[PDB]
Amino acid sequence: MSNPYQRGPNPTRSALTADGPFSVATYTVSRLSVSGFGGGVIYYPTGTSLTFGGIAMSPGYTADASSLAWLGRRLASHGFVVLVINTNSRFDGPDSRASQLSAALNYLRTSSPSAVRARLDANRLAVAGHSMGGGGTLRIAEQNPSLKAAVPLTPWHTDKTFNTSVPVLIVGAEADTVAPVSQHAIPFYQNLPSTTPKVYVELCNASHIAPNSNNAAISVYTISWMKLWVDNDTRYRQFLCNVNDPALCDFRTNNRHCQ
């Protein structure tokens, strides 16, 4: 076997900025059915009988899974099972959101409808989250080394050091005034262990709400990082190596993923 996990056509930067090749179905996880997180929406591939890796995603300065619907759908369409949670509360802090992400991942493994479980390879799991949720991503990554990848988006957290070996790609927003890049995203990046694969990208002319609507840069880098590590799909290395992107105002990496 070459790469059992590889999915979809050969990628072009262009295709990575709109919904991908797989058809997508959704399933609402009602708040009324689960314990350690609010509800959620699972986005998953139909029209295929391959299994995909799984992603749990936390919303940002709200409880609403709808705020990241575009990106749950987006990642799904490129070949993922994606559970976007609602949080228990509007005001849940990063560490509680880490708990909720944990619960959503267990939900995916143990509790999802048969339609979903069928598309899912529960051995290949990753996390993403906006803001507060992004801080959660770092915490949960620190606690579960078996996660494939973490993608914090304009992350916010009071703690600055996370001891994780999970590959991290952080998206900062240059004009973010709620989680300023130099007090949040960049410290997170710098404090990760030296041996962990990591990338920081900073969106020019974007604020904390940048992840809340369709966004080409967030799309390209999130899809590529997920593909690279969840799927071991090195065809995605090209979007994360020798990067040159006018959308970006900063780019930092230890370049372990270009090996």
Instruction: Name the residue range of residue 104's domain.
Output: 43-258
**Residue-wise over 122-142: b if at least 16 C-beta within 10 A, else e?**
bebbbbbbbbbbbbbbbbbbb
Cα–Cα distance between 148 and 161 in angstroms, integer?
19
Give domain status of residue 9, yes or no: no
Domain of 169: which CATH number? 3.40.50.1820
Q: What are phi and psi of 142, to 5 degrees?
A: -60, -30
Q: What angle do CA 78, 176, 57 make, to 5 degrees?
A: 35
Contact 34, 105 (CB under 8 A): no
Nearest C-alpha neighbor of 72 from the set 104, 49, 103: 104
Cα–Cα distance between 224 and 2 in angstroms, integer?
19
Q: What are phi and psi of 224, to 5 degrees?
A: -70, -45
Q: What angle do CA 155, 160, 166 make, to 5 degrees?
A: 70
Give domain status of residue 12, yes or no: no
Cα–Cα distance between 244 and 168 in angstroms, integer?
20
Q: Which residues are annotated as a binding site?
A: 61, 132, 156
**Both tokens of residue 183?**
């007090």
DSSP state of 135: H
Contact 238, 225 (CB under 8 A): no
Contact 45, 119 (CB under 8 A): yes
Kind of pairing, strands 120-130 and 198-203? unpaired
Give domain status of residue 99, yes or no: yes
SS3 of 180, please?
Answer: coil
Distances (CA, A) of 35 to 19, 114, 128, 135: 32, 20, 21, 21
Q: What are phi and psi of 27, to 5 degrees?
A: -135, 125
Cα–Cα distance between 165 and 142 in angstroms, integer?
7
DSSP state of 239: G
Give domain status of residue 190, yes or no: yes
Cα–Cα distance between 136 and 155 in angstroms, integer?
9
Nearest C-alpha neighbor of 36 from the set 118, 126, 157, 136: 136
* SS3 letters across 67-131: HHHHHHHHHHHCCCEEEEECCCCCCCCHHHHHHHHHHHHHHHHHHCCHHHHHHEEEEEEEEEEEC
Instruction: Enumerate the β-bridge partners of residue 151.
Output: 128
Give domain status of residue 17, yes or no: no
* Residue 252 one-letter amino acid: R
- To one decimal, the resolution in angstroms is 2.0
* Residue 47 one-letter amino acid: G
Give domain status of residue 127, yes or no: yes
Contact 238, 218 (CB under 8 A): no
Give domain status of residue 2, yes or no: no
Kind of pairing, strands 120-130 and 40-46? unpaired
Q: How many domains does the chain have?
A: 1
Give domain status of residue 180, yes or no: yes
Q: What are phi and psi of 211, to 5 degrees?
A: -65, -10
Q: Which residues are annotated as a binding site for poly(ethylene terephthalate)?
A: 61, 132, 156
Residues 6+ apart with CB under 8 A from 119: 44, 45, 48, 50, 51, 52, 81
Chain breaks in the chain (C to N over 2.5 A) after: none
Active site amino acids: 131, 176, 208
